[PDB]
Amino acid sequence: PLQQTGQLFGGLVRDIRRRYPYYLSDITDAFSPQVLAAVIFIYFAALSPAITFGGLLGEKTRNQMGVSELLISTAVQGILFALLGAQPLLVVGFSGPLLVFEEAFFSFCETNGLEYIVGRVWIGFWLILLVVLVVAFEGSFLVRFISRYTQEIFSFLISLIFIYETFSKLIKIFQDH
């Protein structure tokens, strides 16, 4: 999956050739109660970060981006990813690193008299150009150099951060009451 073809968008074509043949199985394999229980689990697991980061993005951006925008974006991108993606088991959503960027950018736009909402419209415009070029030149073949070393360091760090934030939320309740 990580080999370089040398053909423009060659990696993109291989991924569709690999996963889309299984599309019929991707509907019939879901007919089990475990899939429904996973739906109910991941619903809360995806809704709660959406609501909490929605409050923060709004508090930090004068509600220029808030809970409703985040919920709609999460829903639309999740629907389109499940319908078209090559690894449907991924869960698409906002994150911590992306909350810090919005605050830095909103502060930058506040310092320079810029509109944050229009700045992002231009950042998003440049994002489309970048990902088209990287996919065109099979730039995702560089992922093969991330071995189990880096993968497990990142995974353990992210799990530890998740547990720490979960406990800090309970700590913040005892302080408020």
Binding site: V13, I16, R17, Y20, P21, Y23
Partner: protein
């Protein structure tokens, strides 16, 4: 105005069917080869 609405509904349905069939045909031609 009713004619415009009916033509709009026909355009929406035709566009939906055509887009779905185009996606299916593109996936088929990419997958068979």
């Amino acid at each position: 105005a009713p004619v415009v609405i009916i033509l709009i509904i026909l355009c929406v349905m035709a566009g939906i069917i055509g887009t779905i069939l185009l996606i299916s045909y593109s996936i088929r031609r990419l997958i068979k080869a």
